[PDB]
Coordinates of C-alpha atoms and ligand atoms in Angstrom, one line a residue:
Chain F
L1 CA 0.5 -5.3 -19.9
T2 CA 3.1 -6.7 -17.8
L3 CA 6.8 -7.3 -17.1
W4 CA 7.4 -10.4 -14.3
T5 CA 9.2 -13.1 -13.4
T6 CA 7.6 -16.2 -13.0
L7 CA 5.0 -17.5 -10.3
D8 CA 6.4 -20.4 -9.2
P9 CA 8.6 -21.0 -6.6
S10 CA 12.2 -21.9 -8.8
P11 CA 15.1 -19.5 -7.8
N12 CA 15.6 -16.9 -9.9
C13 CA 18.3 -14.9 -7.7
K14 CA 21.7 -15.0 -6.3
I15 CA 21.8 -13.1 -2.9
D16 CA 24.7 -15.1 -1.0
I17 CA 25.3 -18.0 -3.2
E18 CA 23.7 -18.9 -6.7
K19 CA 20.5 -19.2 -7.9
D20 CA 20.0 -19.2 -3.9
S21 CA 16.4 -17.4 -4.3
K22 CA 13.1 -16.7 -5.9
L23 CA 12.2 -12.8 -5.9
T24 CA 8.3 -13.2 -7.4
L25 CA 8.1 -9.7 -9.2
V26 CA 4.6 -8.2 -11.3
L27 CA 5.0 -5.2 -13.1
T28 CA 1.4 -3.8 -14.3
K29 CA 2.1 -1.0 -16.3
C30 CA -1.2 1.8 -16.0
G31 CA -1.2 4.3 -17.6
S32 CA 0.9 6.6 -15.8
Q33 CA 2.0 4.6 -13.2
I34 CA 3.7 0.8 -12.4
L35 CA 1.8 -1.1 -9.7
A36 CA 3.9 -3.5 -8.5
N37 CA 3.6 -6.8 -6.6
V38 CA 6.9 -8.7 -4.7
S39 CA 7.7 -11.2 -2.7
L40 CA 10.9 -13.0 -1.7
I41 CA 11.6 -16.7 -0.5
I42 CA 15.1 -17.5 0.4
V43 CA 15.7 -21.6 -0.6
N44 CA 20.0 -22.0 0.3
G45 CA 22.8 -20.1 0.9
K46 CA 23.7 -17.8 4.5
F47 CA 20.1 -15.9 4.7
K48 CA 17.8 -19.5 4.1
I49 CA 17.3 -19.9 7.8
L50 CA 18.2 -16.1 9.9
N51 CA 20.4 -17.1 12.2
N52 CA 21.6 -14.1 13.8
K53 CA 21.4 -14.8 17.2
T54 CA 24.2 -18.0 16.9
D55 CA 25.9 -15.9 14.1
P56 CA 26.7 -12.7 14.5
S57 CA 28.8 -12.4 11.0
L58 CA 25.2 -12.6 9.4
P59 CA 24.3 -9.3 8.4
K60 CA 21.1 -8.4 9.0
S61 CA 20.1 -6.6 5.6
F62 CA 20.5 -7.5 1.9
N63 CA 20.3 -5.9 -0.9
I64 CA 18.6 -7.1 -4.5
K65 CA 19.9 -4.5 -7.4
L66 CA 17.7 -5.0 -10.8
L67 CA 20.4 -2.2 -12.4
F68 CA 18.8 -1.8 -15.9
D69 CA 20.5 -0.7 -19.4
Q70 CA 18.6 2.1 -21.1
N71 CA 16.8 -0.4 -22.8
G72 CA 15.4 -1.4 -19.6
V73 CA 17.2 -4.9 -20.0
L74 CA 18.9 -6.2 -16.7
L75 CA 22.9 -5.6 -16.8
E76 CA 25.2 -8.4 -15.2
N77 CA 25.8 -6.7 -12.4
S78 CA 22.2 -7.2 -11.0
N79 CA 21.5 -9.6 -8.7
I80 CA 18.4 -12.0 -11.5
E81 CA 19.6 -12.7 -15.2
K82 CA 17.7 -10.4 -18.0
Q83 CA 16.0 -13.4 -18.7
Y84 CA 14.1 -13.4 -15.7
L85 CA 12.3 -10.3 -16.6
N86 CA 9.8 -11.1 -19.5
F87 CA 6.1 -9.6 -21.2
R88 CA 2.8 -11.3 -20.5
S89 CA 1.2 -12.7 -23.6
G90 CA -1.4 -11.4 -25.2
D91 CA -3.7 -10.8 -22.2
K99 CA 13.7 -5.6 -26.7
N100 CA 11.8 -2.6 -24.7
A101 CA 10.6 -2.3 -21.3
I102 CA 11.4 1.5 -20.7
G103 CA 7.3 1.9 -20.2
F104 CA 8.6 -0.4 -17.0
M105 CA 11.1 2.4 -16.1
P106 CA 11.3 4.6 -13.0
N107 CA 10.8 7.6 -14.2
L108 CA 14.0 10.5 -14.6
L109 CA 12.3 13.9 -13.9
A110 CA 10.5 11.9 -10.6
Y111 CA 13.6 10.2 -9.6
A112 CA 16.5 11.7 -10.6
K113 CA 20.1 10.7 -9.9
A114 CA 22.2 12.2 -7.4
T115 CA 23.4 15.2 -9.5
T116 CA 26.8 15.0 -7.9
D117 CA 29.6 12.6 -5.9
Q118 CA 28.7 14.3 -1.8
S119 CA 24.9 14.9 -3.5
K120 CA 22.4 12.6 -2.4
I121 CA 18.9 11.8 -4.4
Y122 CA 15.4 13.4 -3.2
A123 CA 13.7 11.0 -0.5
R124 CA 10.7 10.8 -2.8
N125 CA 13.0 7.9 -5.1
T126 CA 12.3 5.6 -1.8
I127 CA 9.1 3.5 -0.4
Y128 CA 9.3 1.5 2.5
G129 CA 7.1 -1.3 4.0
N130 CA 7.3 -3.6 6.9
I131 CA 7.0 -7.7 5.4
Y132 CA 6.7 -10.4 7.9
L133 CA 8.6 -13.8 7.6
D134 CA 7.4 -17.1 8.0
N135 CA 3.8 -15.5 7.7
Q136 CA 4.6 -14.5 12.2
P137 CA 3.2 -10.1 12.9
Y138 CA 6.2 -11.2 15.1
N139 CA 9.6 -11.2 12.1
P140 CA 9.2 -7.8 10.4
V141 CA 11.0 -6.7 7.8
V142 CA 11.8 -3.2 6.4
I143 CA 11.8 -3.4 2.9
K144 CA 13.1 -0.1 1.1
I145 CA 12.5 0.4 -2.6
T146 CA 14.6 2.9 -4.0
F147 CA 14.5 4.4 -8.0
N148 CA 17.6 5.2 -9.9
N149 CA 20.5 5.4 -7.3
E150 CA 22.5 3.1 -8.3
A151 CA 26.3 3.5 -10.3
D152 CA 27.1 1.7 -14.1
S153 CA 23.1 1.7 -14.4
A154 CA 20.6 3.8 -16.7
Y155 CA 17.8 2.9 -14.1
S156 CA 17.3 1.1 -11.0
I157 CA 14.9 -0.6 -9.1
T158 CA 16.9 -1.8 -5.3
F159 CA 15.3 -4.1 -2.9
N160 CA 17.2 -3.4 0.7
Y161 CA 15.8 -5.8 2.8
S162 CA 16.9 -5.1 6.6
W163 CA 16.1 -6.1 10.5
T164 CA 17.1 -5.6 13.9
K165 CA 15.6 -8.2 15.5
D166 CA 18.5 -11.3 16.8
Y167 CA 16.0 -13.5 14.6
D168 CA 17.3 -17.0 16.0
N169 CA 16.6 -19.9 13.0
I170 CA 13.8 -18.3 11.2
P171 CA 12.9 -19.4 7.3
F172 CA 13.2 -16.2 5.1
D173 CA 10.1 -17.2 3.6
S174 CA 8.4 -13.2 3.5
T175 CA 4.8 -11.8 2.9
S176 CA 4.0 -10.1 -0.4
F177 CA 4.2 -5.8 -0.6
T178 CA 2.5 -3.7 -3.0
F179 CA 3.7 -0.1 -4.2
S180 CA 3.7 2.0 -7.2
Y181 CA 6.0 4.1 -8.8
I182 CA 6.3 6.8 -11.3
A183 CA 6.6 5.2 -15.4
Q184 CA 9.7 6.9 -17.7
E185 CA 7.4 6.5 -20.4
Chain T
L1 CA -13.5 -4.4 -15.2
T2 CA -14.4 -4.5 -11.6
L3 CA -15.9 -6.9 -8.8
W4 CA -17.3 -4.7 -6.2
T5 CA -20.2 -4.7 -2.9
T6 CA -22.3 -1.4 -2.8
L7 CA -20.7 1.4 -1.5
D8 CA -23.8 2.4 1.2
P9 CA -23.3 1.4 4.7
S10 CA -26.2 -1.6 4.5
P11 CA -25.0 -4.6 5.8
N12 CA -24.1 -7.5 3.7
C13 CA -21.7 -9.6 6.1
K14 CA -22.1 -11.9 9.4
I15 CA -18.9 -12.2 11.3
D16 CA -21.0 -13.1 15.0
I17 CA -25.1 -12.7 14.1
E18 CA -26.8 -12.4 10.4
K19 CA -26.2 -8.8 8.7
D20 CA -23.8 -7.2 11.6
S21 CA -21.3 -5.4 9.1
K22 CA -21.0 -4.2 6.1
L23 CA -16.8 -5.4 3.5
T24 CA -17.3 -2.4 1.8
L25 CA -14.9 -4.4 -1.1
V26 CA -14.0 -3.5 -4.9
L27 CA -11.6 -5.6 -6.8
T28 CA -10.4 -3.8 -10.3
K29 CA -9.3 -6.0 -13.0
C30 CA -5.6 -4.4 -14.1
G31 CA -4.4 -7.0 -16.5
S32 CA -2.5 -9.6 -14.5
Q33 CA -2.6 -8.3 -11.1
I34 CA -6.3 -7.1 -9.2
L35 CA -5.7 -3.7 -7.7
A36 CA -7.9 -4.4 -4.3
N37 CA -9.5 -1.1 -1.9
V38 CA -11.2 -2.9 1.4
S39 CA -13.0 -1.2 4.1
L40 CA -15.4 -2.7 7.4
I41 CA -18.5 -1.1 9.3
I42 CA -19.8 -3.2 11.8
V43 CA -23.3 -2.3 12.7
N44 CA -24.3 -4.9 15.4
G45 CA -23.3 -7.8 17.2
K46 CA -21.0 -8.6 19.8
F47 CA -18.0 -6.5 17.7
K48 CA -19.8 -3.2 16.6
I49 CA -18.4 -2.1 19.8
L50 CA -15.0 -4.0 21.4
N51 CA -15.7 -4.0 24.7
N52 CA -12.7 -6.3 25.6
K53 CA -11.4 -4.6 29.0
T54 CA -15.1 -5.3 30.4
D55 CA -15.8 -8.2 28.8
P56 CA -12.7 -11.1 29.0
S57 CA -14.8 -13.6 26.3
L58 CA -14.6 -11.5 23.9
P59 CA -12.3 -12.5 21.1
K60 CA -9.2 -10.4 20.0
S61 CA -10.0 -11.9 16.2
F62 CA -12.2 -12.7 13.8
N63 CA -11.9 -14.8 9.7
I64 CA -14.4 -12.9 6.9
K65 CA -14.0 -15.7 4.4
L66 CA -14.6 -15.8 0.6
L67 CA -14.8 -18.9 0.0
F68 CA -14.9 -19.3 -4.2
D69 CA -16.2 -22.2 -6.1
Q70 CA -13.8 -23.1 -9.0
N71 CA -16.4 -20.7 -11.4
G72 CA -15.6 -18.0 -9.1
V73 CA -18.7 -18.0 -7.0
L74 CA -19.5 -17.4 -3.3
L75 CA -20.1 -20.6 -1.1
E76 CA -22.2 -20.8 1.4
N77 CA -19.9 -21.0 3.9
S78 CA -18.9 -17.6 3.5
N79 CA -19.3 -14.7 6.0
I80 CA -20.7 -12.9 2.7
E81 CA -23.4 -14.3 0.3
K82 CA -22.6 -14.7 -3.4
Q83 CA -25.1 -12.3 -4.7
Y84 CA -23.2 -8.8 -2.5
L85 CA -20.1 -9.2 -5.1
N86 CA -21.1 -8.0 -9.1
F87 CA -19.6 -6.7 -12.2
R88 CA -20.0 -2.9 -12.3
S89 CA -21.6 -2.4 -15.8
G90 CA -19.6 -0.8 -19.1
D91 CA -17.8 1.4 -17.6
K99 CA -21.2 -15.9 -13.9
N100 CA -17.3 -16.4 -14.3
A101 CA -15.0 -14.1 -11.7
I102 CA -11.9 -16.5 -13.0
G103 CA -10.3 -13.8 -13.6
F104 CA -10.7 -12.1 -10.5
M105 CA -9.3 -15.3 -8.3
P106 CA -6.1 -15.1 -6.5
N107 CA -3.4 -17.3 -9.0
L108 CA -2.9 -20.9 -7.5
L109 CA 0.6 -20.8 -8.9
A110 CA 1.3 -18.0 -7.3
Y111 CA -0.6 -18.9 -4.1
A112 CA -0.7 -22.4 -3.6
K113 CA -2.7 -24.5 -1.7
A114 CA -1.0 -26.1 0.9
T115 CA -0.1 -29.7 -0.3
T116 CA -0.1 -32.3 2.4
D117 CA -2.1 -32.1 5.8
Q118 CA 1.7 -31.6 7.6
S119 CA 2.6 -28.7 5.1
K120 CA 1.8 -24.9 5.0
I121 CA 1.5 -22.3 2.5
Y122 CA 4.0 -20.3 1.3
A123 CA 4.3 -16.6 3.0
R124 CA 3.9 -15.3 0.0
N125 CA -0.2 -16.2 0.1
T126 CA -0.4 -13.3 3.0
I127 CA -0.5 -9.6 3.0
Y128 CA -0.5 -7.9 6.5
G129 CA -1.5 -4.3 6.9
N130 CA -2.7 -1.4 9.9
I131 CA -5.6 -0.2 9.7
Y132 CA -7.8 2.3 12.7
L133 CA -10.6 1.9 14.5
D134 CA -13.1 5.2 15.1
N135 CA -10.3 6.5 12.7
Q136 CA -7.9 7.0 15.6
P137 CA -4.5 6.1 14.5
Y138 CA -4.4 4.5 18.3
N139 CA -6.6 2.2 17.7
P140 CA -4.6 -0.1 15.5
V141 CA -6.1 -3.5 14.5
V142 CA -3.8 -6.3 12.0
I143 CA -5.6 -7.1 9.0
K144 CA -4.2 -10.3 7.6
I145 CA -5.4 -11.5 3.8
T146 CA -4.5 -14.3 2.7
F147 CA -5.2 -16.6 -0.3
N148 CA -6.2 -20.2 -1.3
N149 CA -5.7 -21.4 2.2
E150 CA -9.0 -22.2 3.5
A151 CA -10.3 -26.1 3.5
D152 CA -13.5 -27.0 0.7
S153 CA -13.2 -24.2 -1.3
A154 CA -11.2 -23.7 -4.9
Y155 CA -9.9 -19.8 -4.6
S156 CA -10.2 -17.9 -1.0
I157 CA -9.7 -14.5 0.1
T158 CA -9.6 -14.4 3.6
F159 CA -9.6 -11.0 5.9
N160 CA -8.4 -12.0 9.3
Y161 CA -8.6 -8.8 11.8
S162 CA -6.9 -9.1 14.9
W163 CA -5.7 -6.6 17.9
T164 CA -3.9 -6.9 21.2
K165 CA -4.7 -3.8 22.8
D166 CA -7.7 -4.6 25.3
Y167 CA -10.2 -1.8 23.8
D168 CA -12.4 0.4 26.3
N169 CA -15.8 0.8 24.2
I170 CA -14.0 1.2 20.9
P171 CA -16.4 0.9 18.0
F172 CA -15.5 -0.9 14.9
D173 CA -15.7 2.0 12.5
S174 CA -12.4 1.0 9.6
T175 CA -10.1 2.8 8.3
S176 CA -9.5 1.9 4.0
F177 CA -6.9 -0.3 3.1
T178 CA -5.6 -0.8 -1.1
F179 CA -3.7 -4.5 -1.7
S180 CA -2.9 -6.0 -4.9
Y181 CA -2.7 -9.9 -5.6
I182 CA -1.5 -12.1 -9.0
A183 CA -4.5 -12.7 -11.1
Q184 CA -5.6 -16.4 -12.3
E185 CA -5.9 -15.8 -15.4
Chain O
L1 CA -5.8 8.6 -18.1
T2 CA -4.0 10.5 -15.6
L3 CA -4.2 13.5 -13.6
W4 CA -1.3 14.5 -12.0
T5 CA 1.2 17.4 -10.7
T6 CA 4.2 18.5 -12.2
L7 CA 7.5 16.0 -11.6
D8 CA 10.1 18.2 -11.4
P9 CA 11.2 19.6 -8.0
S10 CA 9.6 23.1 -8.7
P11 CA 7.5 24.3 -5.9
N12 CA 3.0 24.4 -6.5
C13 CA 2.1 24.2 -3.1
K14 CA 1.4 26.8 0.6
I15 CA 1.8 24.9 4.0
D16 CA 3.4 28.6 5.6
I17 CA 4.5 30.5 2.6
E18 CA 4.1 31.0 -0.9
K19 CA 5.2 27.8 -2.8
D20 CA 7.2 26.3 0.3
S21 CA 6.7 23.0 -1.3
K22 CA 6.1 20.3 -3.8
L23 CA 3.4 18.3 -3.7
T24 CA 3.9 15.6 -6.3
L25 CA 0.5 14.1 -7.2
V26 CA 0.0 11.4 -10.1
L27 CA -3.8 10.4 -10.3
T28 CA -4.4 7.4 -12.4
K29 CA -7.6 6.2 -13.5
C30 CA -8.1 2.5 -13.2
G31 CA -11.5 1.7 -14.2
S32 CA -13.8 2.6 -10.5
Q33 CA -10.8 3.0 -8.4
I34 CA -8.2 6.2 -8.5
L35 CA -4.6 4.9 -8.3
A36 CA -2.8 7.3 -6.0
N37 CA 1.2 8.3 -5.3
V38 CA 2.1 11.1 -3.5
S39 CA 5.7 12.6 -2.1
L40 CA 6.4 16.0 -0.4
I41 CA 9.8 18.1 -0.5
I42 CA 8.8 21.5 1.8
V43 CA 11.9 24.0 0.0
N44 CA 10.8 27.2 2.6
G45 CA 9.2 28.5 5.2
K46 CA 9.2 27.1 9.0
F47 CA 8.4 23.3 8.6
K48 CA 11.7 23.0 5.7
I49 CA 14.0 21.5 8.6
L50 CA 11.8 20.5 11.0
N51 CA 13.2 22.3 15.1
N52 CA 10.4 20.8 16.6
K53 CA 13.8 20.8 19.2
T54 CA 14.4 24.3 19.7
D55 CA 11.5 25.9 18.9
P56 CA 8.1 24.6 20.9
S57 CA 6.2 26.6 18.9
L58 CA 6.0 24.8 15.9
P59 CA 2.8 22.3 15.2
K60 CA 3.6 18.9 14.8
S61 CA 1.0 18.4 12.0
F62 CA -0.4 20.3 8.9
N63 CA -2.5 19.8 6.2
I64 CA -2.3 20.1 2.4
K65 CA -6.3 20.4 1.5
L66 CA -7.6 19.7 -2.1
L67 CA -10.9 21.4 -2.6
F68 CA -12.7 20.3 -5.4
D69 CA -15.9 22.6 -6.8
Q70 CA -18.1 20.2 -8.2
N71 CA -16.5 20.0 -12.1
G72 CA -13.2 18.8 -10.1
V73 CA -11.7 21.7 -10.3
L74 CA -9.9 23.4 -7.3
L75 CA -11.1 25.6 -5.2
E76 CA -8.9 29.1 -3.8
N77 CA -8.8 27.6 -0.4
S78 CA -7.2 25.0 -1.5
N79 CA -2.7 25.2 -0.7
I80 CA -2.4 24.3 -4.0
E81 CA -4.1 26.4 -6.9
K82 CA -5.8 24.6 -9.8
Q83 CA -3.9 25.1 -12.1
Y84 CA -1.0 22.3 -10.2
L85 CA -3.5 19.5 -11.9
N86 CA -3.7 18.6 -15.6
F87 CA -4.1 15.6 -18.0
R88 CA -1.2 13.6 -19.5
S89 CA -1.6 13.6 -22.8
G90 CA -3.1 11.0 -25.3
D91 CA -0.9 8.6 -23.6
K99 CA -12.4 21.1 -17.5
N100 CA -14.0 17.6 -16.1
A101 CA -12.3 15.5 -13.3
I102 CA -15.4 14.0 -12.0
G103 CA -13.6 10.7 -12.7
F104 CA -10.8 11.2 -10.2
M105 CA -13.1 12.8 -7.2
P106 CA -13.4 10.2 -4.5
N107 CA -17.1 8.9 -4.8
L108 CA -19.4 10.7 -2.5
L109 CA -21.6 7.2 -1.6
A110 CA -18.4 5.4 -0.1
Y111 CA -16.8 8.4 1.6
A112 CA -20.7 11.0 2.0
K113 CA -20.0 14.4 3.9
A114 CA -21.0 14.7 7.6
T115 CA -24.6 14.3 7.8
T116 CA -24.9 16.7 11.0
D117 CA -23.0 19.3 12.5
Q118 CA -23.2 16.7 15.4
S119 CA -22.3 14.0 13.1
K120 CA -19.0 12.8 11.8
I121 CA -17.9 10.9 8.6
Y122 CA -17.3 7.3 9.0
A123 CA -13.5 6.4 9.2
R124 CA -13.2 4.1 5.8
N125 CA -13.4 7.6 4.4
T126 CA -9.6 8.1 5.6
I127 CA -6.6 6.3 5.1
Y128 CA -3.5 6.1 7.3
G129 CA 0.3 5.8 6.1
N130 CA 3.8 6.5 7.3
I131 CA 6.3 7.8 5.5
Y132 CA 9.2 9.0 6.0
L133 CA 12.2 12.5 6.2
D134 CA 15.0 12.8 4.9
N135 CA 15.1 9.0 4.0
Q136 CA 15.7 7.4 7.5
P137 CA 13.5 5.2 9.3
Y138 CA 13.9 6.2 12.6
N139 CA 11.8 9.9 10.9
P140 CA 8.5 9.0 10.7
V141 CA 5.4 11.1 9.4
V142 CA 2.0 9.8 10.1
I143 CA 0.1 10.7 6.6
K144 CA -3.4 10.2 6.9
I145 CA -5.6 10.9 4.2
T146 CA -9.1 11.9 3.9
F147 CA -12.1 12.0 1.2
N148 CA -15.0 14.4 1.7
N149 CA -14.8 15.9 4.7
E150 CA -14.3 19.8 4.4
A151 CA -16.5 22.5 5.0
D152 CA -17.5 24.7 1.9
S153 CA -16.3 22.0 -1.3
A154 CA -18.0 19.9 -3.4
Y155 CA -15.1 16.9 -3.2
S156 CA -11.8 16.9 -1.1
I157 CA -8.7 14.8 -0.3
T158 CA -6.9 16.0 2.8
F159 CA -3.5 15.0 3.7
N160 CA -2.6 15.8 7.3
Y161 CA 0.9 14.9 7.8
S162 CA 1.5 14.5 12.0
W163 CA 4.4 13.9 13.6
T164 CA 5.2 12.6 18.1
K165 CA 9.3 12.9 17.6
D166 CA 10.7 16.7 18.8
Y167 CA 12.5 16.6 15.4
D168 CA 16.0 18.4 15.7
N169 CA 16.5 19.9 12.2
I170 CA 15.4 17.4 10.4
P171 CA 14.2 18.3 6.4
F172 CA 10.8 17.7 5.4
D173 CA 12.1 15.2 2.2
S174 CA 9.2 12.6 2.3
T175 CA 9.2 9.1 1.4
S176 CA 7.0 8.4 -1.7
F177 CA 3.6 6.5 -0.5
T178 CA 0.9 5.1 -2.9
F179 CA -3.2 4.4 -1.8
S180 CA -6.5 3.8 -3.5
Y181 CA -9.8 5.0 -3.4
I182 CA -13.0 4.8 -5.5
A183 CA -14.0 7.3 -8.0
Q184 CA -17.7 9.0 -8.3
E185 CA -18.2 7.8 -11.6
Ligands
LIG201 C1 1.4 -6.7 11.8 C2 1.8 -5.8 12.6 O1 1.9 -4.5 13.3 N1 3.5 -6.4 12.8 C3 4.0 -4.9 13.9 C4 3.9 -6.3 15.5 C5 2.5 -5.8 16.1 O2 2.8 -5.5 17.5 C6 1.5 -6.3 15.7 O3 0.1 -5.7 16.6 C7 1.1 -8.1 16.7 O4 0.1 -8.4 16.0 O5 4.2 -5.4 16.8 C8 6.3 -5.4 16.3 O6 6.8 -4.4 17.7 C9 7.0 -6.5 16.4 O7 5.7 -7.5 17.0 O8 8.0 -6.6 16.0 C10 6.9 -4.9 15.0 C11 5.8 -5.1 13.7 O9 5.8 -4.7 13.0
LIG202 C1 -1.0 5.4 12.3 C2 0.0 5.2 13.1 O1 1.1 4.0 13.1 N1 -0.3 4.1 14.3 C3 0.7 3.9 15.4 C4 0.6 4.5 16.4 C5 2.0 5.8 16.3 O2 2.2 5.6 17.2 C6 1.4 7.1 15.6 O3 2.8 7.9 15.5 C7 0.3 8.1 16.4 O4 0.3 9.7 16.0 O5 1.3 3.8 17.4 C8 0.9 2.6 18.2 O6 1.9 2.4 18.4 C9 -1.0 2.8 18.9 O7 -0.6 4.1 19.3 O8 -1.3 2.6 19.3 C10 1.0 1.8 17.2 C11 0.1 2.6 16.0 O9 0.1 1.8 14.8
LIG203 C1 10.8 2.0 8.4 C2 9.9 1.8 9.8 O1 9.3 1.0 10.2 N1 10.5 2.5 10.5 C3 10.3 2.1 11.7 C4 10.9 1.8 12.8 C5 11.2 0.6 13.0 O2 12.0 0.2 14.0 C6 13.0 0.0 12.1 O3 12.8 -1.3 12.1 C7 13.8 0.4 11.6 O4 14.5 0.4 11.2 O5 10.9 2.1 14.4 C8 10.2 3.9 14.7 O6 9.9 3.3 16.2 C9 11.3 4.5 14.7 O7 12.4 4.0 14.6 O8 10.2 5.7 14.8 C10 9.0 4.1 14.2 C11 9.0 3.4 12.6 O9 7.4 3.9 11.6

């Protein structure tokens, strides 16, 4: 079964301003593993067009945080509202889609950190060009005031000069809680 | 269920000359997502051995296009004939394997382009060496005179000097039409 | 169904010294393809902390070899004992998890080599930093005195200076024997 966003271009996400972006996320449960497919289009706000070269105050990284309550429902501090993830019909409780707590343990301590296995790195590309890389860093169960979390960190090193944040797709998997 | 090529080394593909290559492609339907595994061996023609260094007329990129009719059957202009994709037995209509039209919309207009989410980038390696990279660029639903398409673009920047096009394997996923 | 290690941090692997490492490996059968998720934590021995900069005798690569008998059970020369892979309960014979012999043929001859499609390359990161890359090279069916094999080769080029071998996660797939 599948927990997913809509697939259209309509925004569902706040990075900078309300509804400035569309995170397209498809989570497919394949037994003990979630098969995940993600893309990001930014449609408004300061990250729509990366102007790092002409705006030194613009960040070169941002997060999209899916903070889940114990039930597997999004919490308000997430970048996406809980209504924007639904089950796909005959092809709540979403604990079967949550990142496994034994594989991806929370930091033990204020002064401890997670194991690196809680993280996946990938490279995605802006405006469909191989010379516009962005590092996508996906971390499990590393957020305060949440039962489970999936955090998508987007970061880049190039002083991009009017490049639209229209990202290529990325596939990954993670171990499911149950 | 699975839509796949044969797994042997026998050629099934024309890049340059007839039957000059074997695209090994395994598509596994996992609900709403296709889990895809691809490799390429070039056995004849001008791309069998990359001689860019001693032949400046040789391209540094080529496409393998799977152009599908509405039924999910290959069209003649594809690099592979329709007979070379089959269902795996008790483990036509292949619309369940086709790239989703809402997620991967065609270009609206002669002067418009697709969203970047229609594309996946990866790096694969020739002759099993990490110093022989090739960019594999997979694009959905971006081809003229086709209902659906999967295009594999292979490109490289090194002036390769007698390197066999014997590629490492690559895994990806995409959202299914139905 | 799933063939997996435990998910805790407890070591299950010998790279240098007994039980010096935890390979977390989850293999999910999705019809004709195995969906695979791997991470590595080194907890003891010479690779726990990479000190290449101050120990020129330390290798910059090592293997973790899963050598399978015909039944799909680990052989003693593997880096992991056979007890450390088990089936996940109602969600031996593990031939359904073995790398396909037609897709991933053994070398024909003492002087022959495998096709490159028997290999996957990826990049993973140590201590959750994008400036600590390691090349993960996964090769199928390329080991002496084994029916099937999955070999994880880890290699790096940086003279790492006291970097813990605490790896990020990596997803891949391969074609199943049956
Ligand atoms: C798809 C890909 O690998 N992109 C990479 C390109 C490659 O050089 C390609 O080969 C170009 O075609 O190089 C970079 O340095 C760049 O351009 O910023 C890093 C980027 O991640
Ligand atoms: C597997 C891998 O990442 N290959 C990359 C290597 C790395 O440096 C490795 O670390 C070598 O072992 O570097 C390149 O510049 C190269 O050699 O052409 C790009 C290539 O994509
Ligand atoms: C995640 C990632 O791609 N890491 C790569 C970084 C990128 O430059 C990032 O952009 C840094 O944030 O560069 C390397 O040369 C490095 O630092 O050793 C290779 C490494 O594989």
